[PDB]
């Protein structure tokens with residue numbers, strides 16, 4: 148009965164000499180995301196959306212990115228919540244992400260102890276507009292539903 | 297009950313020589329989007345998201361299908377997976393033109409296409425305060441959220 | 447009862463000299479503040495839009511139009527409270543609110559709990575059903591240059 152929603156946002160810069168790691172999947176690319184972790188922009192957005200839904204603050208109040216997402220899952224359960232579903236969008240002009248998506252999903256499902264059909268990941272270009280459109284960064288948006296058991 | 301949430305995003309460049317079609321409604325304007333219906337794309341993505349069926353690109357690579365047909369085909373696929381739609385909410389970010397006059401039309405299109413009571417569909421509008429490409433009239437963005445139940 | 451609905455909201459405002467910085471109803475010590483017709487509380491407007499959105503009552507402009515002079519310098523908390531009242535009058539109880547503020551500066555952490563408390567008070571909710579998150583934009587874009595602050599919101603309600 149006690150449903151809650153959460154929403155998450157992250158962005159990271161694309162820089163030289165860094166691997167591109169999105170949703171736990173390493174992707175061949177001439178740049179990668181800049182950050183104090185592996186800078187996995189998708190997993191940060193989902194992490195914030197889960198903390199948001201459980202009213203536990205945000206990632207920076209709490210903290211590689213899969214370990215952090217697993218810890219997030221732990222704290223959400225610690226607070227009395229179970230995760231019903233996650234959905235997300237990755238905004239990246241390049242590279243193409245569609246062939247890596249089911250893998251990201253599998254990664255996320257494992258990390259949150261959820262079946263595949265409750266996790267979703269989607270991708271969009273930014274039509275060459277703004278910093279996203281010139282490939283200067285990548286954005287992720289997330290939504291999460293939990294229930295307080 | 298087994299509720300699920302989905303979220304959607306889209307953006308399109310704003311240029312002359314195309315008509316402005318948002319939420320299935322053609323809007324008097326000197327420019328249009330490169331139908332490129334940013335609102336219906338966002339919502340479609342939100343619905344596939346809630347059902348966990350990937351995204352609009354994965355379903356529709358439909359050669360001469362407008363975004364309303366795509367939206368209708370989206371809804372049918374969501375139904376087939378066991379999910380009934382509960383509501384949709386959305387925001388259009390457009391520095392111009394004025395969209396308020398067109399909102400009831402957009403909601404009527406969407407509610408028709410999703411087979412929903414009008415009071416379960418909402419569309420909102422915002423400017424970008426002259427900031428960025430949106431605030432300079434170089435593009436328009438849509439955001440959407442959908443709740444479904446299986 | 448099980449008639450749940452979701453809403454989402456978005457707002458942005460320019461950051462300029464000579465205005466008070468008010469986010470989540472908290473006045474933040476800062477050499478700049480948000481520009482708008484009301485007090486420009488970007489976070490509260492985003493949450494307000496999300497609530498109207500969940501209830502299918504249109505948007506903040508429909509209810510409290512910037513073409514109306516009475517909302518000049520309007521207290522966005524009073525606006526949030528009227529929004530919640532109209533949402534309740536449409537038949538909805540609010541279950542939770544989540545949100546994100548994106549700003550290069552100032553540091554918002556020391557003010558976040560107070561924002562959450564204001565919102566909880568205005569929505570007549572306990573603290574554990576309201577969340578506020580803060581993000582930098584990693585130095586990217588007009589947000590990264592400090593030209594504005596953006597807020598995003600999500601709300602879940604139930605028709606009683």
Ligand SMILES: Nc1ccn([C@@H]2O[C@H](COP(=O)(O)OP(=O)(O)OP(=O)(O)O)[C@@H](O)[C@H]2O)c(=O)n1
Nearest residue numbers: 390393394395396421422423482483484507508
């Ligand atoms: N393309 C647009 C832009 C906005 N609006 C209407 O104008 C209202 C106000 O838009 P906006 O100026 O972006 O809102 P705020 O900036 O939050 O207002 P304020 O400055 O008072 O905070 C919206 O809610 C909407 O009803 C519209 O119909 N079409």
Ligand SMILES: Nc1ccn([C@@H]2O[C@H](COP(=O)(O)OP(=O)(O)O)[C@@H](O)[C@H]2O)c(=O)n1
Nearest residue numbers: 207208549550551552553554555580581582
């Ligand atoms: N203007 C801001 C922005 C973020 N923050 C805090 O900083 C943390 C996140 O910062 P960030 O966006 O740099 O996170 P990363 O993307 O670097 O992981 C959160 O805990 C926020 O509450 C803040 O206090 N003030």
Ligand SMILES: Nc1ccn([C@@H]2O[C@H](COP(=O)(O)OP(=O)(O)O)[C@@H](O)[C@H]2O)c(=O)n1
Nearest residue numbers: 239242243244245270271272351352353354
């Ligand atoms: N980096 C990306 C971007 C998009 N895509 C796919 O491409 C589709 C269309 O994206 P787009 O940005 O061209 O969207 P529209 O131009 O159709 O609005 C998405 O729905 C995804 O399926 C991808 O696989 N990888």
Ligand SMILES: [Zn+2]
Nearest residue numbers: 157182188191
């Ligand atoms: Zn991050």
Ligand SMILES: [Zn+2]
Nearest residue numbers: 306332334337
């Ligand atoms: Zn599109």
Ligand SMILES: [Zn+2]
Nearest residue numbers: 457486488491
């Ligand atoms: Zn505002």
